Amino acid sequence: GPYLQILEQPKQRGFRFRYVCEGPSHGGLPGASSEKNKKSYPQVKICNYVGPAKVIVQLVTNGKNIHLHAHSLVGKHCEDGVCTVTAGPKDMVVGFANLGILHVTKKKVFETLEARMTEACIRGYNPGLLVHSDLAYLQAEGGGDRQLTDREKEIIRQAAVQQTKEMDLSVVRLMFTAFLPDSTGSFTRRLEPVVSDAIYDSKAPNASNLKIVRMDRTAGCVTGGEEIYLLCDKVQKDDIQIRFYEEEENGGVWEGFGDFSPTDVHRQFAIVFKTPKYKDVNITKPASVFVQLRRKSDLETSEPKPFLYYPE
Amino acid sequence: GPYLQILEQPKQRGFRFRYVCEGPSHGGLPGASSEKNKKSYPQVKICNYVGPAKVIVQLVTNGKNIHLHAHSLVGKHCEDGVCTVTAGPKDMVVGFANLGILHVTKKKVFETLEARMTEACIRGYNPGLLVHSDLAYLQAEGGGDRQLTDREKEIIRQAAVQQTKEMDLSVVRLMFTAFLPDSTGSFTRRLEPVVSDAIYDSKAPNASNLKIVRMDRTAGCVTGGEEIYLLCDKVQKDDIQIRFYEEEENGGVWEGFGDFSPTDVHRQFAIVFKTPKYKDVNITKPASVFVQLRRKSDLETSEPKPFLYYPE
DNA sequence: GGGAATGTCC
DNA sequence: GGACATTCCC
DNA sequence: GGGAATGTCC
DNA sequence: GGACATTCCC
């Protein structure tokens, strides 16, 4: 039958979440294949159906139990953290440019989360699959402002207080639910939602852009063991490592690692390390390698900086 | 006439203000003579009176006025940010062990300040000195029964807005107010309040003690102009200099300055600078000097480090 | 984006 | 007490 | 918020 | 030695 697919995933990394105090106008969420010269944005497509329809986007959590997220989508076609776009009559590909992710503060998570649940229990933005599987009246179609019961209050409150402690504010996922026209019911044919790849906040320490601001020494002996002070952007003492490497024309690249313990990482912004030994202790002319920061957890690197090895 | 006297003042520096999240048991405010083994506490005494008396302690601002402070007092006999002790009926000296200072969130200064300034006008806590000079309705002592008008509550609001904007969350002062029994039996006779010395939050960036953690080069030539990388603790870029001092004959401390712009302060934790030229460039023996961090604002220093000036 | 003040956690 | 994550500000 | 380190009673 | 404050110090 008819279904909804993700044509272009959102870019997992390199985008920064913004707080309410940071305002908007900090750029739109880019697509997985976006570039500076040719910009690209997340895109879905309605399959096995043509004609008018609507697609709603909303942030969900990242764990196994897909739950609502306290952050919000902001920008064009965005209200109350939910982005709604009408799918064209001819073109079924729905793009989402100028999208923004509003980073809600830790304090405001619970009240924001409990609000989203009470909104989805009335609007019908997938009530059971997100709030809790205990709410019975997953029936939606609208029903107007609907109604509230003093049992649903307890259910919503407990779901919110539970999902608050289970929520990571550094990673969100887009969820696209498509709605097709009904028997003059405007739009209420709920297609199964499609969760996108996890989006990681650029401001998070384990996802920020690695960079080597400067280095104490740019040349050292092949025997290694040379103490160097490296000034860098924010790193995590237990997660960072310093890699020298050279790309051999043979095919296999050589890599060594500067030696340091988490104690040598000074206040997340500098590293004192001893250099490794070059693979050729008995070299004739100086060899030219590069050095870079690398995160153990996800192997992200930094712009390499040159380095020279000398004979004895 | 009976008065109140501060026997031992609170130690002005070294004590760190704590937030609610940091919990209790992070130490009480030590007296000025307390030490690592002999631990004293802030203590006062009601002179020219003997009998049951009630002493209260509040936090007040350090500015050109004595306004109520948004921070709170916590610990034994502390409730609602106010400390209350009962001295007597024979001993009129009373100390305050386990008396910590709770740092209020910036986002809760106004509502806290306004709530306390309104309580000061209802019972006449010198509202012309603690709240606003316009509210000079000193209904002190036997007050407690006054409903504020719609104009006085607006003076309280504007004072709360203004004092919030000018409140220094890094310095507080203890105010001790003594109460003696009246003709009935309960404590009503309010003696002169006494303001203590100013307590300075050690955690403030404008008062955190400087420290040189590491240096890449422990020596340098006398000609100066050598690039040295220095790892330090949290310092402010526009308010830091590196001083090489030599204590020679009859004092005469030779001072050289490390050359660096504020942009060379790497993220408040590192300085890349150039050594100055030594006093006598023509020496022939390594001349031991010391190097330290100096805060151009108040000229406080760190623990110095040795640094040898070798000739050529 | 880059940087720091502010609040949190150990 | 030391170190860091979080939030704010430019 | 962990470790250590006392000082209780048991 | 165990439980249980109580404190001190990162």
Q: Which of residues 47-76 of B touch A (CB under 8 A)?
A: none
Distance, Å, A102 CA → D7 C1': 13
B25 touches strand F (CB under 7 A): yes
Query: H/E element holding A148?
Result: none
Q: Helical H runs in B19-74?
A: none
Interface residue B213 vs chain A (CB under 8 A): yes
CB A270 within 8 A of CB A302: no
For strand A43-47 and strand A3-8, is the pairing parallel, antiparallel, or unpaired?
antiparallel
Solving technique: X-ray
What is the tally of helices (H) and strands (E) in chain B?
3, 20
Structure tokens at A237: 């003492």
Chain B residues with CB under 8 Å of A267 CB are: 231, 233-234, 267, 269
Interface residue A269 vs chain B (CB under 8 A): yes
Structure tokens at A55: 């697609």
Distance CA A81, CA A85 (A): 13
Contact B272 A227 (CB under 8 A): no
Distance, Å, B249 CA → E9 C1': 64
C-alpha distance from residue A140 to each of A53, A136, A151, B268 (Å)? 17, 11, 18, 55
CB B74 within 8 A of CB B23: no
CB atoms within 10 A of CB A9: 16
3-class secondary-structure state, position A252: coil
Contact A269 B272 (CB under 8 A): no
Residue showing tokens 């709605």: A179
3-class secondary-structure state, position B120: helix
Distance CA A136, CA A138 (A): 6
Residue of B214, B216, B267 with shortest CB distance to A269: B267
Contact A227 B216 (CB under 8 A): yes
Distance CA A154, CA A151 (A): 5
Distance CA B29, CA B9 (A): 10
Distance, Å, B170 CA → D8 C1': 18
CA distance B281 to chain A (A): 25
Domains and CATH numbers, chain B: 1-203 (2.60.40.340), 208-312 (2.60.40.10)
Tell me how far the alpha carbon of residue A88 is from its chain's centroid: 28
By C1' distance from the Cα of A14, the closest nucleotide is C1
Interface residue B108 vs chain A (CB under 8 A): no
CB atoms within 10 A of CB B116: 23
Tell me how many degrees the CA angle B124-B125-B130 measures, rounded to the nearest 5.
Answer: 120
Residues in chain A after which the chain is broken, C→N over 2.5 Å: none
Distance CA B146, CA B141 (A): 13
CB B209 within 8 A of CB B241: no
Return positions of chain D under 7 A from a protein CB.
Answer: 1, 3-10
CB B294 within 8 A of CB B303: no
Chain A residues with CB under 8 Å of B234 CB are: 267
CB A153 within 8 A of CB A118: no
Distance, Å, B89 CA → E5 C1': 37
C-alpha distance from residue A238 to each of A73, A190, A244, A268, B270 (Å)? 33, 46, 19, 10, 20
Distance, Å, A210 CA → D10 C1': 22
C-alpha distance from residue A281 to each of A223, A278, A305, B209 (Å)? 6, 6, 22, 45
Q: Which of residues 215-254 of A touch B (CB under 8 A)?
A: 216, 227-229, 231, 234
B234 touches strand E (CB under 7 A): no
Cis status of the peptide bond prior to B89, with omega within 30 of 0: yes
Q: Helical H runs in chain A?
A: 109-123, 127-130, 150-165
Overall resolution, Å: 2.8
